[PDB]
């Protein structure tokens, strides 16, 4: 629902150091917007 | 934006109308949440970090101090407390058909939409004295639920007017005035209990109290006097407890009457000898009366 | 014929069980041998017992309760019960499309889910067969694609006919009131009823 | 004796006043009921 | 008592205003009270808003008024946009400290009458108060 | 209670903005409430932002608006990056010590109507409040 | 099957014991003679009793325990358990290299460590023979070079075949459950179970 | 939990910088709440640093940005050493009393977009804050 | 810092940590001299720390300690100590509170307490008859770490949600002066509101069961 | 654990410090850890009198990987180096506990020299360093 981003220092590519922080974004990146309209349009054109 | 009591405001909402007690003198309030907590010591692991959860809003107490106001709006406190009403007259019914107390609703308002709202409330006490000072009426209330909110119902015609002028107390019995008064103090009550409703259906939800039942009502008073006797052998002003005394107490603007009462006495050998009367109605007594009169 | 509750009557919240006790009864005869073996023999059915307690009740919700209980007594029917702690919809789909082969018996069920269902059961889920009132409890589960198997307690009270269907959701116990032969309510001068409690035993 | 009243909305047409709110408007900045995975599968 | 006839309405600019009212008879001699809709036939309703109680004060607007479904005791009252904007234009300038969007406008009074002599040909107040305007931005 | 009409919004600058609102009847008949979408066919929404509550205040933007679903009862309103960029230069210059990005912008006001008149009333004020802009440093 | 615990499921942190009570049961005929003598005779097996109390449980961990117990009931197997306070290591080494002469009997064991083991057990440590479920307690220990001698209680149930291996760590009791016919659990209003407890008995 | 969008950053002089982040959707309908890796397909990231919120404030740097493990929700952002030198040159001299090695340098934002559905795009300001340079005596 | 070391924090240079679970049973016993002129000295033989407690309330931070001791006697002499002397007092500096580097507006105070609840084992026996008896051993019942914060009530905009009354959970929280730092990696917050003349809020803080070790650091002023 | 680590040296005595690097993964509980292979890593550092980029240098560490498979590395200073610091550190001998004496700031880098001709750097430690005065030869 909310989505959680963990972020952390990068030391050497693909390796990382423990000091860590958290972002708590209040709305999922999956939640849609007015894109609903154009998606309905293109689904109807597929129909 | 901060907030300030010196410009806070209180509005009472009931019956789909709203009462602006403009003439507030003081108020005090708290709010809190109850929590369940266990530390779960275990010989596998003597855990040091507690496990705990918040469950419910505590029932807030509310306390108010109000000056008497011409236009008498505060009589509605007695109406909500559960006196029956006949114009400006109030009566205790000798027995009562209520079970739940009269529920009502409160806004606390401030600048910048910074408002608070108390949803279910009941009056538990009204209490005042005529002790040689501007009579200030205390009220004790409880409320079962609160929340913060951005807005409030306007109220503008039902505003508590100007304060009534001072006047001295009188006490009397059958029109005998009583010599050497020092004070009179009154209290009226509506003792109640909340019905605990919390259920396993409420798990992982915040819980509130929602209903309460009336346990009792009380009306009682105290009087303080200087000790006096008419002549040494007299009997009328002795210590011994009288009973079935009709008793009347008034100011210029307020009147209280006990048609029959029982009097306890206590005497104190302070530097001037003092007497306290404790007053209560008798079981056969008729309805105690209260009246209000507006100053011109 | 559900026992009324906040979900059916949110206005009458006092009807929410203050606390509930679920008991397994597994009647068994057992002895201890001097060589320190334990030996035990099973006969008679397992059955679920339930105990319910209520707080103080106001007259309206009480009258609704009595209006239910006396209807039950007059009709001689059954009391259906929901049990909120198990109310999770972790399995869903066209349950009535599943095929259970006939002749399964004893404590293991295997099913062809035909790829229809989504999600999985968990140990401690409730489980029921569509044509029989019994409530079972999941001990264990396995997949092999569309084929499922579950080992279930208590042992099955029936042989599968092949018409059965599983039921993962909305399981209600069917019960009757063993306490009911001396039932009655105290009325206090508060105007509130008190001391109500119920002892229930499933019945088939 | 008693009088009860409510505001006259544009949608409700006309009906007896009532002692409760009727309608509710719910606001959000986004829809959580639809996933991108669903909406993409639907288009695709 | 004036304590319970009184209701401080709040109109809002550039938009018409309207109320609907239900008349219930009641007696609480039983708990809960016995209640019925009053049959409103042969009544009619009036009222106006004026900028002051004084006898010279301006009539700011007259209500549109109408019984409907008189058997069910309903009635409706309303103001046109022309009324709302005129009072918007004529109310006071001094914005209310708790709510700067709103301004005081004046006093109003609703009274009703029997147009057939029944047990009386008579009139009485039913509702009173004072009127505030919320200012507003969109047309 | 009261309608809670008062709501304030924050717009993130240099990025498009959109808000969705759904109109429902609700019947409290059972614990899972019987909510129902209202038919929005033949309705329209208007709204504007102005710098101050005045007869001739500056106007900053008009909302873009539409109905997404007449039967799910959903309307939406939105602002482009061009609009909100026009905001960001005319909103005030004060910044809070603990919250430097947030700036006051203006007052807003959402008004709804039937496209074909009921005549007795035609529109109502859904919601109102004020708008803040949050400064941002990317494009 | 191994009882679940904070070793097997460390995330179920509540699932450890709040208290235990390891009781010795030693059935005897006793007689009191008029001359004041007390006679005692050892007959039948000594057997360990174990009472366990859990702390309050959340529903998930409770459901895991419930499913385990039902799976035990269904199978009719044995409950295996390890006491953590004894679990603390003292001896370490390749116990497979220890060799026990056959034909030892009575409460004294001797063995050749070949020098492989390190440390020594303390009095009150547990001890077990790899081929038999019984558990014994070390009353005393004596070293002589690499040979060890141990006095154990109770006396050995079986003569040494010469193929045993000792086990000092990870000793599991094999047990059977005495409450099982009436077990039942109360959902507290705060959302926890309480009083969950087991009276286990060894079985041989 | 708290909807914190805000985090400050500490780069270090003479040394390249890089940050990795992992996206998880968390659902609290069932307990404990379930954490799931976000499929990061089709998203993209940007972000910039400039010395003040002002609309004229000059850009100091922009991030290199890349996706790392789309099935695992991993992405990374970084700054080259030259960028770090520019930061160190532009930054304040003023020091910080809690850590005298840190000097204030500017504001940043890592605006993120999705272009997954219907070939149409949307963007939001996922993370924001200040950025500091820490001084280093090793060269 | 040795007070925290004796209280039973684990130590890593100047860093202290609560271990999530502890291998102690007895608390760390130690010994105290009270010394005065003229050999007029007193000696307390077995002791343990029960509390450490302080606040950053706009005043020179003073650290309270509660100790118990099981035995005392008067004595003519004491062990000298001269290099392990507590130095000069650190200069004043103002408190900061923060979450994920968000600073928190309108602080009024922060108050902390740490505990090592213990019980003495009663040992007195009929063997002790006609002898004076002392306590000799105690066992650790519990540890606690907890804090309170007082703030003025503030809101960013009327409809905001972040600074509401409702209790947050899983908040990472950091408290510091110039010279002292305390960190709760995850915490549970109760709130209480008081309608005093300016509206005040109290936060009650506690670590969550899953939280990592709370950290404490000290830094010397130059 | 932060980057911040203070250092105390002993006057007129050689100094040496040892470390090893590991990976960690708590997905197995109790948390797994394994020594990181250090083959190809290299270290640098200096001690300088101030954070100011103009500040004078006081000393440079010697440093060496000691076991790549155990992931261990070491740092040291000779008594000649420490002597150079002793001559030049501050003289604010504390009135009550005089042995401790401030000298400066330090930073230690490592460079992951590696195949592929990439290189990257990250700072492992950073702090203040103090001398303790040395009364005996």
Residue numbers in the entry:
A (entry chain f): 8 to 54
B (entry chain L): 2 to 297
C (entry chain I), G (entry chain H): 1 to 204
D (entry chain d): 6 to 49
E (entry chain S), F (entry chain R), H (entry chain Q): 2 to 140
I (entry chain L): 76 to 297
J (entry chain T): 4 to 140
The article reads:
The first layer directly interacts with the last TTP ring and is composed of an inner trimeric ring of TTMP surrounded by a dodecameric ring of LtfC. The inner trimeric TTMP ring is surrounded by an outer ring composed of 12 LtfC monomers. LtfC adopts a compact, single-domain structure composed mostly of β-sheets, with each TTMP monomer contacted by four copies of LtfC. A cavity remains between the TTMP and the part of the LtfC ring distal to the tail tube, into which LtfA is inserted. The N-terminal portions of LtfA form a lasso-like structure filling the groove between the LtfC and TTMP rings, such that each LtfA copy extends in opposite direction as observed from the outer end of the helical bundle. The capsid-distal LtfA contacts the capsid-proximal LtfA from an adjacent LtfA trimer, enabling the formation of a closed ring. The β-strands of all LtfA copies interact with the LtfC ring by augmenting their β-sheets of the latter to eight- or nine-stranded sheets by donating one or two strands from LtfA. The loops of the two long β-hairpins of TTMP extend tailward and contact the next ring, composed of six copies of Dit. Finally, a trimer of TTHP closes the tail tip complex. The cavity enclosed by the TTHP also contained additional density for a small α-helical coiled coil region, which was assigned as the C-terminal part of the TMP based on its location within the lumen of the tail tube tip, the fact that this region is predicted α-helical, and a close fit to the AlphaFold model.
